[PDB]
Structure formats: structure tokens, C-alpha cells
Design a protein around this ligand. Structure first.
Ligand SMILES: Nc1ncnc2c1ncn2[C@@H]1O[C@H](COP(=O)(O)OP(=O)(O)OP(=O)(O)O)[C@@H](O)[C@H]1O
Ligand SMILES: Nc1ncnc2c1ncn2[C@@H]1O[C@H](COP(=O)(O)OP(=O)(O)OP(=O)(O)O)[C@@H](O)[C@H]1O
Ligand SMILES: [Mg+2]
Ligand SMILES: [Mg+2]
Ligand SMILES: [Mg+2]
Ligand SMILES: [Mg+2]
Lengths: 592, 593
């Protein structure tokens, strides 16, 4: 009963009530932003709104402050729910069922979507169990206290933390917000099925020696020899323990039995799950590589396995981009860097390949890559934070961005100006000069701080995410795969959607509500940095006109709509712009 | 490394080779029986045949003895696989991929089906790790040594032991063939959502006191009071641990958090999973009830959850059948009994009900029932065995049926006659006198043995399985749902398929290959017992002519074809006859005899 009751102790009536209030608040706000419903001003009161269930008989009433880019800052405490003239408790599950038709939830998707909602609420309950920490307290804790202290997740997606596949015990062991140390499972994979791809400067033997140590390498060698096997025929693959215990040991039982796969045991180092869940920071040795693992759990619109076939191209692309950054003085002056995916390993399951198509999750169950740590490059007085921290608000209403602005002693617009030159200017130059787009959200960006000021930004998650939006661009063989055909009037969405509407809308609204920086000042600083860039590069004036960042309007691209339409595979990934749902337009805050 | 490497130690190259040979043997045999392919005689040798892949380029060659009911006794040692003029190793996964179109495996189902094959093979490797035990050794061990010592599973279905949802550690903890003790998880379920239904003579308070004991009852009471709750508002529901840790604490987290469900902790008694996986025998107190739990894993064509809505009528239906058995002298003279489903509890998840349709697995995640133990009724010198043991063959080639025949000192036909009067005669009478059909396979039947002789049969798995094949039958209200509309020329399949073609085919073939009893003698004995029943009841002659058990032929109803067509829900269950795949006819072994 003790471990049994402890595992569910975070699930209490009061925490569940709070979690539901918060999640329904987010659902009202973001589903309004995407025009799934239009909140109508309420019968008495001004600034109070009502949204009704599908059949009209249930009313959700609330107050909200409206801000730029159609942002609805819904007040959590103001939300009421009424049916038949009686107040009802707030329950996100009932919410989605009552609105199943308005929100476009098919009968096939709704039950699974409700599981993701339930897990997101359970995660909020666990996070409410943790010690309260201020923004300053997080900064004092450091890089991983910030990483595991984030509570919101992706700011747009309501059903963003499902992690479907975790039992509650596995949730407690593996969720990044629990910050429990994890030991990776190491497998020996026969070279008839497994391939190791080394980035520029990497050598397999020395790479493995540096990552594991001579003693552990010798122990693994001895396991293989104890089985009568030649270690030279095998490669090392680290795996998430969930994947081993629940998928590889069962789904790949034939590979284990025939000794195509050999379980070597656990790593000596202790690892911490990052916000992506499936990527691990090495806590014992922060200078060692991240390990990104295949995890066949559902989270935020995709199964989180990792494609064995694509590992073959991954290090080279990083090398290519790394050279591009290094040879461009505009990018060099911004201090931009990437933490490269340096090495990758993939296992090709021949029978499942014969049994499936190219995009199956069965081809994504066993692969791993290693990513450079950002810690070694730190200079004196510098510290690291995930960019998501900028829009994390603590129990007192203080955000990390606000705490940093205060601690720095600079004017808010000046602090913002440094942040924008580190993070946003490189995106402008990549787009205009190279047709290059990232996916630069809060989880894919790390900020280097000194004296409370953003010194420079580090990008990650590269080979899977970058796009060169020119099908006929001249590119080296191993990089030519990132080219894509994106319609002309959608290319600048890489800035409009991914930067403005999916991150800056939240940061500007937060800093305004926090009474640190007014909306007009935020967006004026953004416009100033944009023109500061463009006026410095008249050789691109034509492209500046072709892709006008100062147009009066741009398309509203809805993110939740993607997940509500297809829970398991939000976008094709072979044609990712085909699933986008642009619903009208937003007024560009840069129009002035 | 220690627990990691131990958990997969049963997965070795030699055990995997043996498992793949055995499973491909079964696939050739049963897919031939169901006419998915027709083995072509290989020129030159009398009993050698060849089966080819979809593209014709891979050949599986084997010897087989052909037996009644189109039974193919494929010899495991003879199987070879050749492609492009080269011999290849035997691999069940490759077999199904090579034959995906011949077998009707869609692109959606094939990968999941391969997972079921892989887990079946892994279970065989584990079973190969266990101490070798003879048929006599199993009989010496007793009821649960036999229950967990069964190795085949269902004799028709090739992908019969998937248990999809178990990780390898959960396999080791929960699979019936590992026989590791299990402690059930007890939940308190609020009476606004959970309902307890008792059979006649059952009382909730005394029922729980007898099953748990006053100490545990009060401990659970104190858990509820410690949270400020009134125990009178709650009911107890036992749950499979896998179900709690993987489904109820996550999928029903809203119910746990709001205290509609309260985790009370583990039971004191230790339980053993039975062949059905989700039903548990109480090892600490064998006289106490079985607990059948909801288990949302896929096995042999169905998710194994338990419907909350059906619980309310389950005890009453059992009571009804019990009285029927009790008032009929023909059934009484056979010694037939059922172990009743005596109590049941169901949890109605209102949000998931609103979000799904009546067939959803989401409505089958939280329910339980309690089934009488057969141990108390045992008399002096009597022992118990699953009927599945009769077709279990040990490492020396002796079946448990052969061991019992030898130990009894009876001639094989005389032994068989006692077994048939206990097991088969009640099925004849249920059909002809009541339009009643069971699902009487090896796992749903327990045999009572004395002096190596079958004294009587115990039927289980009742309310969800019985069918009254008469839509206008006069029945008490709470029982009327067991009525069904079955096409006329399919009603007698309840004997032809479920008894003859799905169990006696294997028993007869096995006792013949074992050189205990010739096929003709087996089937002649079955014919004799059939006439022994029918001649004793001339008032039913019309029905005997209407449903002729001596007809020259009857339909071949294919079992694997169902699972190959629909991995997750082999049959509708609102209309179970519509999914059946009849492919030609079989020669009735009783036609001559
Ligand atoms: N604030 C955040 N913004 C964006 N994604 C987030 C955030 N917090 C958590 N995530 C998680 O990160 C994942 C999506 O990000 P993405 O595809 O970029 O990561 P990945 O490829 O899985 O991992 P990595 O970034 O280590 O390569 C989802 O699992 C999502 O829920
Ligand atoms: N020899 C066997 N014959 C039939 N089924 C078997 C056998 N061995 C194991 N089984 C398993 O029993 C299960 C299906 O049987 P059925 O639906 O009759 O039982 P249940 O309702 O799950 O459990 P219970 O019999 O306890 O009520 C499957 O999981 C099947 O694979
Ligand atoms: Mg990422
Ligand atoms: Mg990614
Ligand atoms: Mg059964
Ligand atoms: Mg059943």
C-alpha cells in the first residue's frame, strides 16, 4: 500500500481542481486565438465573455484581457460553468466532450485525446506537489533546476504533456519535471543490422572511450566475449529503459534471442530527462554528450521514436550547418552557435522493414544520437537557461524574463534588444540570406546569460528540423534532403508563426501583464531590430520586398487544430505544410 | 545488469530455434486444416508435401500424417525452407511476411500480428527454460502444477499467446506459465459509480468478510476514514496490478484524484494467474473464490477487459443455469456442475461512456467477478485438472490422457467412455432439450479424476458465453439476453465446431499418434455415446432428425481466419455468427460409425 499509495499521492481533490481550472483557462484562451469558438461579450458586465457547449445549454463565462496577435489572457479565477441555471465544477474532460463537435474531435480520436488531457492534468498535480520556487530561486538552482522546473510546456498546445505509454510508476521515474536520475540501458547491436555514423572529427573507438570510460567498455567487451561473440562485430546503442523493458525486449525478442542484440546492462553515469522527455543530460558529467533516445510514447502530436534510416544523414547536416554559421560574418557577430548532433547509431529491423512502409513507427524503435553539451563553451560568469524559462511565471506572478531584466539593471527595451540580437536576428539572416528555417521554439533554444543579460543563443534539434526552402538550391549530397517545396506566401510563416505568434505573443503579453514592459514598447523594439538588420544589408532589398515582414497582416496558422484533427501524426513530415490550417489573418504588430 | 540480463535469459538462440520450428509446424498444420493453402504432394515420397510463399519462390517442405477432420499432423523435425536454390533457417516472422497475402493479413494488421507471434515465441522460450516434467509429474504436482504446466494454449489459434501490453518484467510477474504469486490491488469505488451484484444467498458484508477477513476489512475501512470518507459510500473492487499501474491510475486519474476511486493497497492472500491470464486462483486459501479481473491487454482475438454493464446480470444468469442443471435428471446423472459466478462488481465511467460507443474497450477497464472454487466439492481420492491437459504432451511424447488411461488400468475406449459421459453427454442434452450452447473448450472445462478416471465435469465462464438458440424462448427477464438468433443450419455447429473440430480432433489424433487408441475406435466410441443418449430420449426424436449429428458432412468453420481478418475483435458479439468463415465441408467421422 505504501509504494502503491505514494505513487498516486499527487492526485488529490484540491490539486485536481486547480489543474482543471488552469487547463480549462488555457483551452478557452488558445481555442479562442484559433477561432474554434468566438467568445461573445456577456449579458451584464463589460470584458466578461461566454463560450457555449455544442448544444448551447452549458455556458463557460470568464473575464479576459485582449492583447496583440489576438491573444486572450483569460483569468483563471473568473471562470464559471453553468447548465440548467446551476453552477457545475470545472472539468476539462467534460469540457472536451461537451464541445466535441465545435473542436473537431472525431469519435476515433476523442477517447485518446482525453487520455492525453488526463495525463497533462496529472502532471500538473505532480508539479503542484513540488516545492514552490521563485524565478530567482530557479536561476540560483541553475540550468537543470530551470529545465526540470518548467511547468507550462508548449504554450499553445493544450494537450501538450500526454506521454501516453507511461504507467504512473514510469511517469514518476522518467518525466522531466520529476528530475529523477535515470540510468541508460546499453545494447550491443550486430553490424549486419546496425550502423554508426560519425560526424566530422569523430572516431568510434575514442568516442566510446570518452563517453563510457575504459573500465565500462572493457566490462561490455567481456559480456560479449562471455557469450562467445566477437566484440568487433557489434556497435553500442544506448536505450531509454522504458523502451527496453516495454518494447525492445518484447517486440524485438527475436533480435535479442538470436544475439543481433545483446543487453549489456546499465550505464554508470546518471542522466536527467530534459523537456523533450526522450533526450538526456548527463548529470554526473555535464561536459559529456546529451543522449537522444527512441521513445515509442505519444506526446504532443507525434510518437517519439527515432528513425534508424535518418541517423545516417544526421551528423553531416550538423557539420554543414556548423560550417555555414562559421563562415558567415553576420551570424558570427551574433554569437550564434548550434550544439551539434555529433554521432548517431541506427538499427535496421529487416523483417519489420519488409512488413511496413517507410513512415511506420515500427522502423523508429531503436536508434540514438549524441549531441554536444553546451557547458564546456561557458566563459567566466556565464550561465545557461532554456529559452522556455522566459515565459515561465512563478507562484508570485514573476517571470524569469522579468527577474532577469530586474537583476540586469538595464532598461527593459535594452535587455530585450540584447535578447533579440542573440535569438531573433540570426533567424532573419538565415531566412533572407539562405532560405533557411529552424523550428526555434522555447525548447529548441538555449540562452547564455551573463549579468542577467542574454549574451548569445544556442540552437539544437537540427537535422530533424531545419528546412532550406528552395527545391533547386545547390547543396552538398548529404544535406540535399533538407530541401523542401514551401508555397511562396507561406515561407515567411517561419517567422510569423514560429516566432511571433507562437513565442513572442506570449512573452510580450507576459511582460505587459507583469508590468515590466508595455506591448507597444516590445513590438517597437522588435521592429527596430528588424530594420536595424535590413538597413545593414541593402544587397537583400529585393528579398526584403519579396517577403515583407512589415505587411499589415499575415495568416493565422492554428496549432491545436493540427492535434485535434490527427492526434498521432499532426503533419506528414514528407509534406509538412499540407496539414497547416490557416484560418483568416492576424494584424501584424510591426505594421506601425 | 543483473535484473536486466536475467529478465531476458530465457531468450537464447537454441530455444528460439526450437520455438520457431514448433510454431511454423503449427502454422502449416492449422492453415492447411483451414484451407488457407493446399499442401501439394512432393513427387517421390508418400507423406511429403510442399507449401509456397505468395510469390512462389520460397518453399516449405515437410512430412505429415493425415487424420480425420482434415487434421494435418505435421512433423516438426522434417520442415525445411528453401529459396533461390539455398536452404534458409526457419523463422515464423518471415513465414507470415512471405505469406501475408495468402493468409489475408492486411497492412494494418500484419505488424501487430507479428508482435503476437513474437510474444507467443517468447513464451515458448520461457516454457523451455522450466524444469522438464512428465505427464505423471504434472499429475503428482496437482491442480495448479497442471494449470501453469500447460504449454500449448488454444490448439487451433497459431497466435494464441500474445498478451500484448506486458513488458518482459510484467510477463515474468503475471503470465500463468511462470506461476509467480500475485497480490491483487484493492480499490474503494464510490457508490455513485460502482454497483455490487450478489447471487442468491450472497450478502455483500459477509461476502467481503469471508473473502478478506475482518482484519483487512478494518484496515481498508481505516484507510478510508483517514481520508475523511464514510466507508458506507464505497464498494471494494479487486484489480489486476498491471491494470492498476498502467491503466486505472492514468486513464482514470480523474476518478482517483476526486476520490471516486481510492487505492486501498494489496491483498494478503497470494494468487496465481490461470490459463485465461486475467482470472486468479487463491493459492493461500484454495477454497476461496477465483477473482476474474479486467485486463486491457490483447490476447487471442480480444482485449481482455471486463464490461461493467454486464456484471449486474451475471450472478442471476448463473443462478438460473444452476437451477436448470439441478432440476434435470439427465444432467444430474452425468454429475455435471458449474462453478458459479457468485458475485460481480462494475464501475460505470460516465465520461468515457459518453465519449465512446457500447463496444469500446474504455468501458471494460474496471470490473471484477468472483467465481466459486471447485476445491470444496472434492471427495476422497478426487483430484482436478483442466481439460486442456488431455491434449498436453510432455517431453517424452506421453499425453496426460495417456498417463491417466495407463494409471486407471482400463481399456482406452472404456476410459474414454467415462470421460465422454461426463463432458460430452451434457452438451448433447443442453442442445437438444434446451437449445443451450456453451463454449466448452479445454480452458473452460475442469475434470474431476478418481483412480485415473473422469468422474464428472465442471463448466465455467458462464454468463458471458452461454447462448440460448431460440429468440422467443421463455426465460426470466434478467436472463433473456442470453437468447440469440442463430441460423438453422449453424446451430449444431455448437457441437461440430466447438467439440468435434476444435478439441476431439486433437485428442483423437494425439491418442492415435501416441499408439494408445486408434482413430476409428475413438470416433466409434463417440458415436456410441451419442446413441446411448439419443435412444434414452425418444420423445426428442424430431429434434434428433432436425439436427442430425450423423450427417455425412458439416461445415468447416475456420478459427485462425477470424483472427487474421480482425486482430482486435475476432467476432462482433452482438451478432457472433456473422463473422464466422465457413469454407467448404468436412467429412463427419460419425457418419459411418
Ligand atoms: N516549452 C516547450 N516548447 C516546445 N516544446 C516543448 C516545451 N516543453 C516541452 N516540450 C516538448 O518537446 C517536444 C517537441 O519538441 P521537438 O520535436 O523539438 O523535440 P525532440 O525532437 O523530441 O527532442 P530534442 O529537442 O531533444 O531533439 C514535445 O515532446 C513537447 O511536448
Ligand atoms: N487450451 C486453451 N483453450 C482455450 N483457451 C485457452 C487455452 N489456453 C489458454 N487459453 C486462453 O483463455 C482465453 C480465452 O478464453 P475465454 O474467453 O473462454 O476466457 P476468459 O473469459 O478470458 O477467462 P475465464 O475462463 O476465467 O472466464 C484466451 O486468453 C486464450 O488464449
Ligand atoms: Mg526539440
Ligand atoms: Mg525534433
Ligand atoms: Mg474461459
Ligand atoms: Mg469468456
Amino acid at each position: 500500500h505504501m509504494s502503491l499509495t505514494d505513487a498516486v499521492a499527487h492526485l488529490s481533490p484540491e490539486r485536481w481542481e486547480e489543474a482543471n481550472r488552469l487547463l480549462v483557462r488555457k483551452a478557452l484562451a488558445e481555442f479562442a486565438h484559433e477561432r474554434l469558438f468566438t467568445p461573445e461579450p456577456a449579458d451584464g458586465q463589460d470584458g466578461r465573455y461566454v463560450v457555449r457547449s455544442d448544444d448551447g445549454l452549458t455556458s463557460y463565462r470568464f473575464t479576459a484581457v485582449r492583447r496583440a496577435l489576438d491573444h486572450w489572457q483569460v483569468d483563471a479565477g473568473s471562470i464559471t460553468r453553468t447548465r440548467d441555471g446551476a453552477e457545475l465544477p470545472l472539468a476539462a474532460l467534460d469540457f472536451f466532450i461537451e464541445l466535441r463537435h465545435t473542436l473537431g474531435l472525431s469519435d476515433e480520436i476523442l477517447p485518446v485525446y482525453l487520455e492525453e488531457i488526463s495525463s497533462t492534468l496529472s502532471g500538473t498535480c505532480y508539479k503542484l506537489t513540488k516545492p514552490q520556487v521563485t524565478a530567482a530561486g530557479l536561476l540560483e538552482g541553475g540550468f537543470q533546476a530551470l529545465e526540470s522546473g518548467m511547468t507550462e510546456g508548449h504554450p499553445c498546445f493544450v494537450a501538450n504533456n500526454g506521454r501516453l505509454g507511461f504507467g504512473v510508476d514510469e511517469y514518476l521515474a522518467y518525466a522531466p519535471e520529476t528530475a529523477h536520475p535515470v540510468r541508460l540501458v546499453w545494447l550491443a547491436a550486430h553490424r549486419s543490422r546496425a550502423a554508426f555514423t560519425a560526424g566530422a572529427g569523430i572516431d568510434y573507438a575514442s568516442f566510446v572511450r570518452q563517453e563510457l570510460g575504459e573500465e565500462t567498455v572493457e566490462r561490455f567487451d567481456g559480456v560479449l566475449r562471455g557469450r562467445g561473440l566477437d566484440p568487433a562485430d557489434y556497435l553500442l546503442i544506448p536505450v531509454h529503459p522504458w523502451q527496453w523493458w516495454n518494447k525492445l525486449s518484447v517486440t524485438f525478442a527475436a533480435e535479442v534471442a538470436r544475439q543481433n542484440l545483446v543487453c549489456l546492462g546499465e550505464s554508470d553515469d546518471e542522466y536527467l530527462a530534459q523537456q523533450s522527455i526522450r533526450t538526456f543530460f548527463n548529470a554526473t558529467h555535464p561536459e559529456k554528450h546529451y543522449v537522444k533516445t527512441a521513445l515509442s510514447v505519444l506526446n504532443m502530436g507525434f510518437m517519439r521514436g527515432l528513425s534508424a534510416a535518418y541517423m545516417e544523414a544526421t551528423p553531416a547536416i550538423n557539420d554543414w550547418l556548423d560550417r555555414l554559421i562559421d563562415n558567415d560574418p553576420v551570424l558570427k557577430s551574433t554569437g550564434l552557435s548550434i550544439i551539434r548532433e555529433r554521432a548517431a547509431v541506427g538499427y535496421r529491423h529487416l523483417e519489420y522493414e519488409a512488413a511496413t512502409d517507410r513512415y511506420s513507427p515500427y522502423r523508429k524503435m531503436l536508434a540514438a544520437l549524441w549531441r554536444e553539451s553546451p557547458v564546456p563553451a561557458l566563459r567566466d560568469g556565464e550561465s545557461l537557461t532554456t529559452m522556455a524559462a522566459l515565459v515561465h511565471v512563478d507562484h508570485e506572478g514573476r517571470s524569469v524574463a522579468g527577474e532577469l531584466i530586474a537583476r540586469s539593471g538595464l532598461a527593459p527595451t535594452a535587455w530585450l534588444r540584447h535578447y533579440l540580437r542573440a535569438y531573433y536576428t540570426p533567424l532573419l539572416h538565415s531566412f533572407y540570406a539562405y532560405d533557411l528555417a529552424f523550428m526555434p521554439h522555447g525548447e529548441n533554444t538555449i540562452l547564455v546569460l551573463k549579468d542577467g543579460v542574454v549574451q548569445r543563443a544556442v540552437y539544437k534539434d537540427i537535422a530533424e528540423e531545419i528546412v532550406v526552402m528552395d527545391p533547386d538550391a545547390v547543396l552538398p549530397p548529404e544535406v540535399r534532403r533538407v530541401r523542401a517545396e514551401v508555397p511562396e506566401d507561406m515561407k515567411l510563416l517561419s517567422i510569423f508563426t514560429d516566432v511571433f505568434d507562437c513565442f513572442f505573443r506570449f512573452l510580450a503579453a507576459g511582460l505587459a501583464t507583469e508590468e515590466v514592459l508595455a506591448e507597444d514598447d516590445f513590438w517597437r523594439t522588435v521592429a527596430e531590430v528588424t530594420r536595424e538588420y535590413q538597413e545593414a544589408h541593402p544587397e537583400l532589398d529585393d528579398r526584403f520586398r519579396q517577403y515583407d515582414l512589415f505587411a499589415p497582416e499575415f495568416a493565422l496558422s492554428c496549432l491545436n487544430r493540427l492535434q485535434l484533427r490527427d492526434n498521432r501524426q499532426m503533419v506528414d513530415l514528407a509534406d509538412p505544410s499540407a496539414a497547416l490550417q490557416l484560418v483568416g489573418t492576424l494584424r501584424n504588430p510591426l505594421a506601425g
